[PDB]
């Protein structure tokens, strides 16, 4: 008997989703596959609403006994957010594997097929359980907490220079190397099963001559949180400093992230806002949205950034 | 005798400009050194008005026969913009070497002293001429066109994964490996000699649920250009698409860059705005500002992006 | 009530051991320090005989109640071997942190002082326990299983492209991100407490026109094992294939590694010898050398390569 | 009219040479293609005598007015050697492009088809001239001087951490970014046109407890050169120092390279043998072999290592 894998489609160039089984007949030797269409939009259009629907459905399917693992086909453009959202909102140790493609299915040497094969193989493997949400492309198995799209148009784009990959897929075999040393899945305190709408969170970029009016626009629309993609280690300019303090005076929680692409944004009492640890602007937004459904205490939200 | 080098201080933790020559006595074997204080601010607060002052001063010094090269002490936070600005505005083949430090001068194993030594050595080397503006940190010699701060807090933060370094400094010797295959310095058409104020350009970030009102804020303040740090290869959401087309109808030139960190944003007739080629959002802003001093024509500006 | 850390010196430019301790007075805030001279040689002359003495000395100290961790100053040249050797021979959860320096103590911006600070900082932190042998340089905390010198002369040389670092040291604070998913230290079956002399193992490189007579030389001198630093994924030429099979007929255990620098060498029934998994030629030698002290069974040794 | 490209086949899993031309019909839009079978072997079996045949054939083809460029299908295992050999022996500015595949043609998502398309596109582009020998895989255009297989089994294996790529291929467009700053092809003094057999050169690895008898083996078999894949920056042990000096006394030229994978091996008057600059053990052997057809003078050979 083979494992039971459920493929949730959200759109992307990886694909209908029912044509894939006929195009990749090697999946038959992996597991019993059942497809399901959740959404049909590009990742660039992936919204906070669809992530709620996706997460609730994942927790419902993983609760069943006739479901061993879930493979989620998604677009590459916002694969920095999606997997990490599920990494904090899934209440099961069963494998949730995100898969995508950098080349269209009709392109020469399309990466779709092999990426899909690797994703299902990971979800059907019992050793891959309890490792947090996973992302599989280019024979790599990345952690949702660290993996991000580092290049605009290459196949090997998904990397995590400072953290590497959890494991790899070579010669039709899986090789696990490291484990995520952060709070994830079953040990997470974030439960959005009842949540209907998530708090609004903007992302403002840090740069030379950065305008203060961007922060004013976020305040006008009464957003609950702001992630600052700052220069270097979350460093603020005189205009950015004024904009952040103006937001904090309105009760808005501001988290200082970095535009660099990796590294630690350290705590600093001389600067306003909380720090994003090693979380990117995109992922810092996700954690902030979920943290705002739980509390408004700066010290508690700061704890989440150093632990999740 | 030895070459004549002028150290231009603008701020940063690497520094007063008079103390710099005292802490590193090994500089005396490299060149005859003079210092000037162009500015005294943190890189996070570096502005366009100061870059105009710096570029004009550099060109005045390099035109003199008694100046062989210049070294510019600058902060790391916006070292992505400054060197590239001068890479477009400098009118001489004489080496312009930006140098910075990731650790305070008082810290244990401060990187400043060796970085400055490496920078002065590069500026005093005759073989360093006609290579564009250089950036020297951690024994590496990078191009202003490709080098960016890839990590928020590490010593080896300045990288260019797709382009590498122009050269390295090992065992008190310079090793050049590659040359910049783009337009720069003496062949550049950008001139700010008679410029008092440059056209304003903002950078808007791309992410899930990205607000269209950020573009409205840029429009209301009459910016001449907008750089979009897009999802993946500069992909726009439904809200981002509407915000861009609204900006274009007001005469605002928009260029689609990427939040990924590297790679090519390819042309696409299905999306609005121009494409940033391999230019990062920070460097795209700098090039756009200078491009807007010569023309507003989309085709001519697009050509600049594929050539500079 | 500060932790008790003992510093064991073996050699390298980072180093007597007494002169270093007082050169970094910031160590006093970390823990109580005591130094011991195990050896005084460049790492290029480090031998398996000295590793036996070092591993036993470490085990004596880690058995004591008045010792919380050990810091080992070593050279960078063979820092690929040493730490991994103790990762299999140390029988304690207490932190064993290897440290080195790429620049001499007298050089401008020497890295030693900070590297030593980080090493002691890590060895004194109770959260460092049970993570295997650690290697600390350039604000990084790498696993002895993955970390290696990737560059001949740079400060940031120690990297692990496919696995990243276990953690980083930023702003006088430790940030752990990953855990080694391999058998190490306390769970290790390798015990050299009563071993006086380790089996001899040679490393033979793979390349175009590689001679078979190198394998004949290993056989003639009676080595117990041979590590093949093969082309690509351990691919053997006509001459390498013949040499390996000739060694196997004499009882020599051969393991196929890779000259590439990273990646998996997959099992192949068409080629002779065992496979090194993701272990480098240097680390494969250390493991094979320890595996030969227990068994000569090809099946048992092959499994050591997939678990350790 | 379309350019005239000749595809030379030597072997590899990417491939009958006429079988591939039919497998990728998109090649017809690039250029007029002809195929020749130079050899049919796995790159692990590539030898210097075949390189002589290949180089001599490439030179006579490029000398023809009806040939605009050459694409060479090859295996990945020794793609570190071959391209660099031709980088020193080709007497034409016309593009010589090596291409390979990490996955067999029959595998799912085989990279072969796209790599070949990229290779032909590069060879057919007139702007590819005067850039030295090129290597095209995974949408990247690497220099024969820097590019190497950095991973045993991944598609993106071919990288050059410190130098990057000469250009990239995105959206059916070539983007040249850097140019090789070394002597190559047309300006190279190495000519093997009238060479029937090349000097024998061995590569000896550096590690803890490295045997001196490996050097004795090379001496006994009368090699003309020895490349030392040394520890760190070409560091020798007591045994390695004695072996190298012993070889030098027999008139054998020894070059100290590095097992690290990248970086500069600096000159050192305290150690024996010449230094490899930034050349890897694989590429160092190729240069030494070619240099030995012209001279045995250590100074001249050392100069080749810093220039080529
Ligand atoms: N804009 C598309 C790109 C195609 C893809 O990478 O999946 C998306 O993100 O869905
Ligand atoms: N915010 C400071 C950091 C110190 C430095 O990088 O020099 C600056 O960029 O100037
Ligand atoms: N050969 C010396 C290099 C200096 C160092 O890196 O410590 C050693 O490895 O000990
Ligand atoms: N041993 C084969 C591997 C397959 C390939 O890379 O083409 C070769 O190098 O030719």
Automatic annotation (TrEMBL), chains A, B, C, D:
Q: Name one GO molecular function term.
A: asparaginase activity
> What UniProt keywords are attached to this protein's entry?
Hydrolase, Signal
Q: Which residues form the L-asparaginase N-terminal domain?
A: 4-179
The keyword Chloroplast belongs to this UniProt entry's keyword annotation:
no
Stated name of the protein: L-asparaginase
Keyword ATP-binding on this protein? Answer: no
Residue limits of the Asparaginase/glutaminase C-terminal domain? 201-305
Which E.C. number(s) belong to this protein?
Answer: 3.5.1.1
Instruction: Return one Gene Ontology term, BP aspect.
Output: asparagine metabolic process
**Family to which this protein belongs:** Belongs to the asparaginase 1 family.
Record-annotated active site: 13 (o-isoaspartyl threonine intermediate), 13, 76
Give the InterPro entries listed for this entry.
AsnASE_II (IPR004550), Asp/glu_Ase-like_sf (IPR036152), Asparaginase/glutaminase-like (IPR006034), Asparaginase/glutaminase_AS1 (IPR020827), Asparaginase/glutaminase_AS2 (IPR027475), Asparaginase_C (IPR040919), L-asparaginase_C (IPR027473), L-asparaginase_N (IPR027474)
Pfam families annotated for this entry?
Answer: Asparaginase, Asparaginase_C
Q: What class of enzyme is it?
A: hydrolase
| Recorded superkingdom | Bacteria
Write down the species. Pectobacterium atrosepticum
Query: Which positions does UniProt annotate for substrate binding?
Result: 43, 76-77
